[PDB]
Design a binder for this molecule. Structure first.
Ligand code: SF4
Ligand SMILES: [Mg+2]
Length: 752
DNA sequence: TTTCTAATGCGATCGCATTAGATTTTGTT
């Protein structure tokens, strides 16, 4: 009645009776269109209202897609949000049984690093560590985000190296010195326990929290107080747990305590997901238990969705040959055969020319993409594709309109940042030449032996002969070019105007440096004609992050913009996307270009060779994640064999989550699919061989493969130091509503 | 003026000097 016909296998998902129910929805099978097809059957045929619908996904986009596919149906015939927004609401209502304060602020990944580095550099003690601060606060932030993901709380972690150190110093076969290092990493978790515990005593003293503590608190309000769960169960009568294969441990005992731990059988609960696209489990660190954790005391049912819609055959002969014999539920089926083209070339740039030529002979002769494992690898491929004659799509503080705004702001606060003086003296406004830069250094020296003398400097007061106090004192014009002396007086008169504004608020500097600079008039003149009036998106994204910050503009806002270049890779601004980047996007032409060794399989620090990894005795996934025995170990050559076999079991498990990146990057196909992998890398004396996946797939397609069958050491350079010149003649010669607007603007300027 | 890991391949199970790469990345009010 107004839509397409429902499939006969999808009807069991739709017309299932109320109760818990698990669906194994495979790849490309359109799971959302049969999540919304159960909301409609549970509204028009009774059993619920529109207001009693709850859906929970991870990403904020794939909740908005499900938000509309319910309301489009229910208007043709109403509460969808993420997991981490359902935690912040579950602590604004019930968040006083467990004593947290309401209206608690949430720290950014940068403003958390500001606070974590300040409790490491204020620790009274010894620490016995060969590391530096800013490298023992990358272990504090990595255990205390992994202790609050398995719900551990710092007391199960003390004295876990005992009954392992007793195994090496006893049992007389020295202790081989590979086994002391493994013993020295585990007396280092215990050593840093008072750092990841005086950090929580300060985040509770200022009432500010994180994302790994939202779900850690909301899952300790779940299983502890039954009353909070009962109110939620009454409010929502149908609950939709989409993407359940990526649900962590802390998110698992917060849903299985609220929504049906065997409690209610009138609630329509449905949870979808396949075990074989579990790519994200190295971050969340996570379904087989479903039907054992959401029971009636009978176990829960199980159904399947194996018809694949946006995927041709022969990408289901390759994807089913990769996934089977290692992992596999049951194989999925199609409903013309899309082609496969495999290749192997003796150079990266040759293999960047093979994948470009098949992508250029389908554009000048469709929806195309490139799926790469490494973020860095993108750039070269992009340039190559662009160069043939194809248009190509691919940090905020590296944008050249904000970078200039970051650079001339710093030169106002401290005149010892010389690396932001050569951003300005060599920039497009006031282009200096190499003779005037070197004439300013020689003035900057004119304005300026034993252990005590050597340590006298490296102070916060010592004078270092910097350039920026030779612009405010340039001398006489016999040292400079005659056109370059008018610019030193101009930039010295401009800075003294701006340096008197450090008493003003932090935002009104940034709005006055923006006016005095030629910004937001030269940023709009570098955009094409058909783009519109749009020039200042991410130059106005910056100027709301400076006001949401406030602040002192010298220590604050300049040592905040330096952590945020390190910690979160610039900031967030306003196809050659990576393989994690597209998980729900299907194109026509999909190329997976680099399948060499040490690249696509990407080989790795286990729990026994670094501090931060949590020992598998103590995590909530333990028997996967094989925990070692150490009971029959009555020797010391056994202990170097009962552990080295355990490391190879934790390292083969690393490889089984790389086939899942084949099975999730092959089934995004819908058409022809490209596969390649090079033979010489870029900087290797010995060439990198193709990975197992590519030599394995050449044994699948051989039962069409293109002709596969001392490195590249060339130099890349640059030289330092037109319609603009042509368009300047038109304005020189003369000197949509553009006539009356100028008459409006010249009124206010000419009216005192 | 410059760091650190887990490798590799000679020796006298192991020490012991020499050299390649540095991931991927959601989530509030
Ligand atoms: S030219 Fe290259 S090597 Fe020289 S300073 Fe610039 S980035 Fe560094
Ligand atoms: Mg020296």
């Amino acid at each position: 009645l107004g839509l397409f016909p429902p499939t006969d296998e999808q009807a069991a998902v739709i017309a299932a009776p109320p109760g818990p129910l698990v669906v194994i929805a495979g790849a490309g099978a359109g799971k959302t269109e049969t999540m919304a097809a159960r909301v409609v059957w549970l509204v028009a045929n009774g059993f619920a209202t529109p207001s009693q619908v709850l859906g929970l996904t991870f990403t904020r986009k794939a909740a908005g897609q499900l938000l509309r596919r319910v309301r489009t149906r229910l208007a043709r015939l109403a509460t969808v949000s993420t997991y981490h927004a359902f935690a912040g609401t579950l602590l604004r209502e019930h968040g006083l049984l467990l004593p947290v304060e309401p209206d608690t602020r949430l720290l950014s990944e940068t403003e958390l690093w500001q606070l974590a580095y300040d409790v490491v550099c204020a620790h009274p003690g010894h620490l016995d560590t060969e590391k530096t601060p800013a490298a023992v606060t990358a272990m504090v932030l990595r255990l205390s985000g992994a202790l609050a993901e398995h719900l551990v709380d710092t007391d199960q972690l003390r004295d876990t190296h005992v009954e392992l150190e007793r195994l090496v110093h006893t049992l007389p076969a020295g202790p081989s010195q590979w086994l002391l290092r493994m013993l020295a990493t585990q007396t280092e978790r215990t050593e840093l326990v008072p750092l990841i515990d005086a950090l929580h005593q300060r985040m509770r003293a200022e009432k500010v929290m994180d994302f790994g503590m939202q779900m850690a608190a909301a899952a300790r309000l779940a299983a502890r107080f039954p009353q909070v769960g009962e109110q939620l169960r009454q409010r929502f009568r149908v609950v939709l747990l989409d993407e359940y294969q990526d649900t962590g441990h802390a998110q698992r005992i917060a849903l299985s305590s609220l929504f049906g731990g065997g409690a209610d059988d009138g609630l329509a609960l449905t949870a979808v997901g396949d075990p074989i696209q579990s790519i994200y489990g190295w971050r969340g660190a996570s379904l087989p238990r479903f039907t054992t954790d959401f029971p009636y005391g009978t176990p829960a049912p199980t159904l399947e969705l194996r018809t694949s819609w946006r995927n041709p055959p022969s990408t289901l002969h390759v994807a089913n040959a990769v996934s089977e014999e290692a992992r596999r539920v049951r194989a999925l089926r199609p409903r013309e055969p899309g082609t496969i083209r495999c290749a192997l070339l003796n150079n990266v740039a040759a293999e960047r020319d093979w994948v470009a030529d098949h992508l250029a002979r389908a554009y000048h002769g469709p929806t195309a993409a490139v799926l790469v494992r490494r973020n860095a690898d993108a750039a070269p491929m992009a340039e190559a594709l662009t160069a043939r004659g194809v248009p190509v799509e691919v940090g905020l503080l590296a944008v050249p309109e904000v970078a200039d705004l970051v650079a001339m702001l710093r030169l106002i606060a401290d005149p010892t940042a010389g690396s932001a003086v050569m951003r300005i003296l060599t920039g497009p406004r006031w282009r200096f030449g190499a003779r005037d830069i070197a004439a300013l250094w020689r003035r900057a020296v004119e304005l300026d032996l034993g252990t005590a003398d050597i340590v006298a400097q490296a102070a916060p007061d010592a004078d270092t002969a910097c350039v920026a106090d030779a612009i405010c004192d340039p001398g006489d014009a016999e040292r400079y070019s005659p056109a370059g002396y008018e610019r030193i007086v101009a930039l010295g008169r401009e800075l003294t105007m701006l340096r008197a504004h450090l008493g003003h608020p932090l935002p009104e500097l940034v709005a006055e440096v923006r006016r005095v600079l030629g910004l937001d008039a030269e940023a709009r003149a570098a955009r094409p004609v058909a783009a519109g009036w749009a020039g200042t998106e991410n130059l106005d994204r910056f100027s709301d992050l400076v006001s949401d910050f406030a602040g002192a503009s010298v220590s604050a806002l300049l040592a905040y913009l330096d952590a945020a270049v390190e910690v979160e890779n610039g900031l967030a601004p306003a196809q050659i996307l990576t393989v994690h980047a597209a998980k729900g996007l299907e194109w026509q032409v999909v190329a997976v270009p680099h399948l060499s060794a040490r690249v696509f399989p990407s080989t790795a620090r286990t729990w026994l060779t670094d501090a931060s990894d949590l020992p598998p005795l103590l995590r909530g996934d333990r028997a996967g994640v094989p925990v070692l025995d150490t009971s029959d170990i009555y020797d010391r050559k056994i202990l170097s064999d009962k552990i080295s076999d355990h490391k190879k079991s934790l390292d083969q498990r690393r490889v089984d989550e790389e086939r899942r990146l084949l099975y999730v990057a092959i089934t995004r196909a819908e058409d022809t699919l490209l596969l390649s992998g090079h033979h010489w890398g870029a900087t290797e004396s010995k060439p990198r061989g193709p990975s197992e996946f590519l030599c394995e797939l050449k044994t699948i397609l051989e039962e069409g493969e293109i002709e596969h069958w001392p490195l590249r050491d060339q130099v890349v350079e640059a030289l330092w130091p037109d319609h603009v010149h042509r368009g300047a003649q038109l304005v020189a010669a003369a000197m949509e509503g553009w006539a009356a607007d100028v008459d409006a603007l010249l009124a206010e300027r000419e009216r005192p």
